[PDB]
Amino acid sequence: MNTVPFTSAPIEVTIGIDQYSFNVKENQPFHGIKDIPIGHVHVIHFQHADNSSMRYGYWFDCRMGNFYIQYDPKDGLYKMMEERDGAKFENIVHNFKERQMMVSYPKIDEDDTWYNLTEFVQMDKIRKIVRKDENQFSYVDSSMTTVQENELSDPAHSLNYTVINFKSREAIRPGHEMEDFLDKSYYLNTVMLQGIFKNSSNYFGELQFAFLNAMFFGNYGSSLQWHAMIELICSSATVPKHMLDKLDEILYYQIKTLPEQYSDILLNERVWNICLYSSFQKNSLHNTEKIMENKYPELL
Amino acid sequence: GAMNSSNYAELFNNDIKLFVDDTNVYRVTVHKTFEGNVATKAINGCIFTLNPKTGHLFLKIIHTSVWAGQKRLSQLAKWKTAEEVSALVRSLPKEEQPKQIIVTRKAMLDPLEVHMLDFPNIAIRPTELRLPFSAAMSIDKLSDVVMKATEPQMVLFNIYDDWLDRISSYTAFSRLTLLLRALKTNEESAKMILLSDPTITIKSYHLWPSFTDEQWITIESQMRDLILTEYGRKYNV
Ligand SMILES: CO/N=C1/CCS(=O)(=O)c2ccc(F)cc21
Questions:
Q1: Rounded CA gap, A165 and B115, in Å?
Q2: C-alpha of residue A92 to centroid of ligand 1, in Å
Q3: Alpha-helical regions (H) of B55-198
Q4: Residue B76: its chain A contacts at CB < 8 A?
Q5: How far apart are CA A288 and CA A258, in angstroms?
Q6: How many CA atoms lie within 13 A of B164 on its CB side?
Q7: Measured between alpha carbons, how far is B108 from B22 in angstroms, rounded to an integer?
Q8: What are the sequence ranges of the domains in chain B?
Q9: In chain A, where do the E strands start and end?
């Protein structure tokens, strides 16, 4: 078990850790979150009480270093910062964990939600979508645009998700125009899986990461990317059987975890109706279809 | 974006553009089988690809063999249209290639866009106009070459005959769409108007009769009357 230590909490802020969240008052004595599970990536995220504009946060993995939060009053945000030292990161926290004012990462032992949302997500891949190589952790916020959005303006601050475009030469073989546009199997299996992603686990990893950025930060380009990666699978007649079964599980837990009041903006009617009811894989997503119908029957 | 009543004069400017109409590509007769079920029999069709400024018509005849052993023909027809339009563009010299292609039905947008990915700078546009180009097969010489074809064939026409010697493209297109709207609303009466007098001849190298200017005004009036009436005979007014 590992801990994210906070220098202090000078501005009132709602703090999220994975799917949990709690309110901290201005200058409340708060030095962190403990019992953070090893073996998964995590995200710690922030929404200031005064400006609900800009939800922002940090993807990190405790195995990759000792990470802490300190507020910067010039830039006006809680920053994740790195301190390599067992004669400092240990010498400072060992004092902080004698005075007990952290809440437990509050994991119910029956609960596999976070594992199920991050099964295929790996920090090394996050750090390639979010390019800032001097840090072991990755910053994302509400406003960051994606590479594909910028093609249609600061590159250093972009989300470099894999570009998917169904009406592109990458997607459409010359002479197979109609075939490839109505059955994207070529583009999914040859271009994307074998060529770009190398395997389905990397594909699912980016899909899961896009969903989580959409959910936690309201990042619109991430939501676009999540729906595009779903639609590319559902619109392929030929998908490995293991991928379909796993996709049904992935989507089930994402739909399960979505806030009920955010379905209006985070869920694209056209993609979901096409995927569950019109597409090649209409009959292959039983768990996802059942939860979508019992929880969001309006969208459909 | 889409073409409508507001940007109508763009059709006649000096940017090359083509209208593509696919309504006559896949044509069938419906009949009963010996067992009393219904079946279709395809007949020859055509793509109607028109330069509205110049009158040049690229009539690509769609021979029934192209459907043999194929499924979902109405969907295939749109992709076949787009394949042939894109082939036509590639066949034209660069300075003859269109800067825009306007499809008369919105279902052609995605098939044409995908077939034209190699031409990123040719705009594929829908239109809100209800153009009457389905009635092209009511022009006897066009119908005749389509039905007689025994293999795929491209036939070139000027759908304006010699009219541009005397009138502008705007006026020529207006006359054409009037004639075709009439032919579509009441073919028999439209054809009686045009062809009730066998001495106003159609030149061997033309599609329509050799009307004088004054006879064209009478003709056009008679076509308007027909369209207004049919609109009464239909809604009772
Ligand atoms: C008052 O804490 N100041 C600091 C900055 C120096 S550090 O890197 O050792 C550090 C580490 C963890 C922490 F929660 C706070 C601090």
A1: 15
A2: 6
A3: 73-91, 109-115, 140-148, 169-185, 187-195
A4: 178
A5: 13
A6: 13
A7: 8
A8: 9-163, 164-237
A9: 2-5, 13-17, 20-24, 32-36, 42-48, 56-60, 67-72, 77-82, 103-104, 138-141
Query: Which candidate from A167, A169, A178 shows the least CB-CB separation from B113?
Result: A167
Residue with CA nearest ligand 1 atom 10:
A89
* Phi-psi category of residue A35: left, alpha or beta, with phi > 0 → left and psi -120 to 50 → alpha: left
Strand pairing partners for A4? A33
Element (H, E) at A188: none
Q: Name the one residue in this structure whose structure tokens are 């590509």.
A: B25
Domain B164-237 has CATH 1.20.80.40: yes
- DSSP SS3 for A258: coil
Greatest extent of chain A over all pairs of C-alpha atoms, in Å: 70
The answer to whether residues B3 and B10 touch, using CB atoms and an 8 Å cutoff, is: yes
Looking at chain A, the residues that come just before a C–N gap of over 2.5 A are: 152
Beta strand B123-125 with B100-103 is parallel
User: Which resolution, in Å, applies to this structure?
Assistant: 1.6
At A224, which CATH number?
1.25.40.550
Residue with tokens 């192209």: B66
Nearest CA to ligand 1 atom 4: A7
Both structure tokens of A36: 């953070």
Task: Please name the method used to determine this structure.
Answer: X-ray
Query: Domain range holding A184?
Result: 116-296
Q: B43, B29 in Cβ contact below 8 A?
A: yes
Phi, psi values for residue B133, rounded to 5°: -70, -15
The CA-based dihedral angle spanning residues B155, B159, B163, B168, taken in that order and rounded to the nearest 10 degrees: -120
State the alpha helices, DSSP H only, in A171-219: 177-182, 185, 200-217
Q: How far apart are CA A66 and CA A254, in angstroms?
A: 29
Closest-CA residue to B157 (of B235, B229, B67, B59): B59
In the numeric block, which tokens belong to residue A50?
């005064």
Q: Do A177 and B111 touch (CB under 8 A)?
A: yes
For the segment(s) B9-163, the CATH number from 3.30.379.10, 3.40.50.300, 1.10.20.10, 3.30.420.230 is 3.30.420.230
SS3 state of residue B151 = coil
- H or E element: which one contains A298? none
- For residues B25 and B81, is the Cβ–Cβ distance under 8 A? yes
